[PDB]
Amino acid sequence: MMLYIVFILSVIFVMGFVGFSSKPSPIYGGLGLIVSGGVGCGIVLNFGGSFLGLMVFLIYLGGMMVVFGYTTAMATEQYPEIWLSNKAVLGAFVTGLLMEFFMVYYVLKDKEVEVVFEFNGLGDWVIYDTGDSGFFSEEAMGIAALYSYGTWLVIVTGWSLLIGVVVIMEITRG
């Protein structure tokens, strides 16, 4: 059912993590992370985080992961080893999926599972806010507040990014 979209997305989220955490060639490991990032945006979108979700696409996927793939093409791999051709990767990949499936199978059946900690299974929709009718995006109001409340956050973040430029040039000079 559509009421479980967030749970369904979070299930795919985990499989994507098993995909690259079993560590195939970093070409495919990067692909597994891109799919997890897209699913991660989907989860954040359904909790009302439109701006935060699109930052995942714009910054995490369109920025950081492009550079990861770019660097992989130069310094790591150019051709990939056949996916799952290694026993360790396949074993880890199969191990994660089965653990994930057993978690999902039981929570769905019981509407609650106890994987180490207690988790409900009624649906994520049940914890949502009930009354809302402001004429603005609260999520947008908070991020915009960075420039009126977070003077300190801007300064240290701005400084760190400038230092990142300086440092990376020092590191790579040789």
Binding site: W152, V156, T157, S160, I163, V166, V167, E170, I171, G174
Partner: protein, 347 residues
């Protein structure tokens, strides 16, 4: 490195630490650690050799992993308390992660493996920052979250560090590895007393920083990085051998030297809490450190090792390194025991 850039990078290291120590918000604490790590990598890389590259890589992975665990603890805390204030944590699972994250940053055993390797792979001046200034930020957090720390976990980390640091140093001839294992053992004493009296953690930290800075400065003055290189100092700077002798005996906790004071005050605090076996075990295990400090004194000061003919050329040239604050640091490293009650300024 351009001298202006080097100063700016050094101030960023300091600023990252300061942010951690003045923040009341966990996000700003995490930002401080991130900033600090960003600026420390260039000074580890500044001599551009494969060993420096390996050290910086091993450092980056360890600190990055720890900062991820720190953020995970912060978010778990947010889930169960709905706030970001830097203080005790409100979930036992968050406390274990934060404690392990900070133990990883400090290099305490059994997360200690990086400290000897990173210190060996970077210059002496970088090792001085790594083993002194870099302890301030993690210790200042531990100082604030200790009420929620699991007692068994923190004391286990302390005991293992004293054992690992003591045993690891026995097999070392490299001066930077000796200092690294000395550091691991001394972090153990600092965290053992943290649950009982955080003031004694600060006292041990400050005194440790002074003596460690003294040793690194004296190693830099002569460009010595090995035991045998240090054994030539008698035939060049005889005074330096006496200072090295006194500082090493102080680091060994021998009365009446300054390095006795932190061990002495820590034993007092734990006995007041009816903890007798732990202080006794720690003091005895600390004799392992005293052994390989004494070995250095034998090859450096109390005996005259063989020299080389080309050393005569060095007799004709003066010592031109800055040696900044060495006369002050060495005096504080050795002669502060009569002023021990002054530890209340830290209260």
């Amino acid at each position: 490195m351009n001298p202006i850039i080097f100063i700016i990078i050094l101030l960023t290291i300091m600023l990252g630490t300061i942010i951690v120590m003045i923040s009341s918000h966990w996000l700003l604490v995490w930002i401080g650690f991130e900033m600090n790590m960003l600026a420390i990598i260039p000074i580890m890389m500044k001599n551009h050799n494969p060993r420096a590259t390996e050290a910086s890589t091993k450092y980056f992975l360890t600190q990055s992993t720890a900062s991820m665990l720190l953020m995970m603890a912060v978010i778990i805390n947010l889930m169960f308390s709905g706030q970001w204030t830097v203080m005790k944590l409100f979930n036992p699972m968050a406390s274990m992660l934060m404690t392990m994250a900070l133990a990883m940053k400090l290099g305490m055993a059994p997360f200690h493996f990086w400290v000897p390797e990173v210190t060996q792979g970077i210059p002496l001046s970088s090792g001085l920052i790594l083993l002194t200034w870099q302890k301030l930020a993690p210790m200042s957090v531990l100082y604030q979250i200790f009420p929620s720390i699991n007692l068994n976990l923190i004391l286990t980390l302390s005991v293992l560090s004293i054992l690992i640091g003591g045993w690891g140093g026995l097999n070392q001839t490299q001066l930077r590895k000796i200092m690294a294992y000395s550091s691991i053992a001394h972090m153990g004493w600092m965290t053992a007393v943290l649950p009982y009296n955080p003031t004694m953690t600060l006292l041990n930290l400050i005194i440790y920083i002074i003596m460690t800075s003294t040793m690194f400065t004296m190693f830099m003055a002569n460009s010595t990085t090995t035991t045998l290189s240090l054994s030539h100092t008698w035939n060049k700077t005889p005074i330096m051998t006496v200072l090295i002798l006194a500082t090493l005996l102080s680091m060994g906790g021998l009365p009446p030297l300054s390095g006795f004071m932190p061990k002495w005050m820590i034993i007092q605090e734990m006995t007041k809490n009816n903890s007798i076996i732990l202080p006794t075990f720690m003091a005895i295990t600390a004799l392992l450190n005293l052994y390989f400090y004494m070995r250095l004194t034998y090859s450096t000061t109390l005996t005259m090792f063989p020299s080389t003919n080309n050393m005569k050329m060095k007799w004709q040239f003066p010592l031109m390194k800055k040696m900044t604050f060495l006369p002050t640091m060495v005096v504080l490293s050795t002669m502060m025991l009569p002023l021990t009650p002054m530890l209340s300024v830290l209260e």
